Amino acid sequence: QVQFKLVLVGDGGTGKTTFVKRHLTGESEKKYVATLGVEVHPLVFHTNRGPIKFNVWDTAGQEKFGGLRDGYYIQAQCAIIMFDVTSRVTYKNVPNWHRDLVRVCENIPIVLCGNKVDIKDRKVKAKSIVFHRKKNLQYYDISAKSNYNFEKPFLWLARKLIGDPNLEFVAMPALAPPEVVMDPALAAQYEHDLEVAQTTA
Amino acid sequence: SGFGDKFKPAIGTWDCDTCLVQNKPEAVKCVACETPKP
Numbered sequence A: 001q002v003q004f005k006l007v008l009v010g011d012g013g014t015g016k017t018t019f020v021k022r023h024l025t026g027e028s029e030k031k032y033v034a035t036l037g038v039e040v041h042p043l044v045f046h047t048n049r050g051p052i053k054f055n056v057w058d059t060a061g062q063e064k065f066g067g068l069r070d071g072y073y074i075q076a077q078c079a080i081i082m083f084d085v086t087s088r089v090t091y092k093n094v095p096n097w098h099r100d101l102v103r104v105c106e107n108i109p110i111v112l113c114g115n116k117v118d119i120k121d122r123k124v125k126a127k128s129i130v131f132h133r134k135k136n137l138q139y140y141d142i143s144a145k146s147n148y149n150f151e152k153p154f155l156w157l158a159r160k161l162i163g164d165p166n167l168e169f170v171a172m173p174a175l176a177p178p179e180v181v182m183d184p185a186l187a188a189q190y191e192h193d194l195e196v197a198q199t200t201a
Numbered sequence B: 001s002g003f004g005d006k007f008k009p010a011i012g013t014w015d016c017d018t019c020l021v022q023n024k025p026e027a028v029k030c031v032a033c034e035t036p037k038p
């Protein structure tokens, strides 16, 4: 079975635990690592070429960048950097998390995720989200509490790790039902805003 | 159709049962979490 260690990093309170826990089987089969203060969630996705397992490392704590225990980053094969679109400080720390990550994990695929986009009073909008462009990374809006775009980071990483740009997920994993509403018109506007930001200098 | 031919580590490679990290055949404990190889 093909499995990949995915480190999920970002400021405390950005929604990392809420996000990973959406995957019900990854939550029921999670593994606690006492020496590193981490819960490892085994997240299976079913692709058109079979199952892929992301073993997602979610810190139990509220660590600053640079403050995770030695071992957390070892043998990571991919990563998600998360910030909170309602908190500008957490986006301004994205470069610090990226620096912390590549210090130990030299050349791994990384997705940048801006969480809590269900909250209407959004502070970090598409026009301000540029770090992924400067570092040639992929970015997605997500809402952990509504499952909005849950599969997007994993599909992007799966394609990079398997070397197959046409890889697809044949079905969504069983997810905890949405706890908040993600307005479909808001999602469409945000997706449009990101496309416009990308197509201009 | 599968992607098995991309992942063929050395004989004796083993997975940590505590943190699921893949370890090398000569390792006697996990390189990430220090759990002993069973």
Ligand SMILES: Nc1nc2c(ncn2[C@@H]2O[C@H](COP(=O)(O)OP(=O)(O)O)[C@@H](O)[C@H]2O)c(=O)[nH]1
Pocket: A010, A011, A012, A013, A014, A015, A016, A017, A018, A019, A062, A115, A116, A117, A118, A119, A142, A143, A144, A145, A146, A180
């Ligand atoms: N409205 C909304 N709240 C969220 C979302 N994700 C997390 N929250 C909340 O943000 C707080 C911190 O979430 P948590 O998962 O503990 O963040 P962590 O410290 O990065 O693990 C919690 O009160 C969550 O309920 C989201 O997508 N939308």
Ligand SMILES: [Mg+2]
Pocket: A016, A017, A018, A059, A060, A061
């Ligand atoms: Mg947490």
Ligand SMILES: [Zn+2]
Pocket: B016, B017, B018, B019, B020, B021, B030, B031, B032, B033, B034, B035
């Ligand atoms: Zn281990």
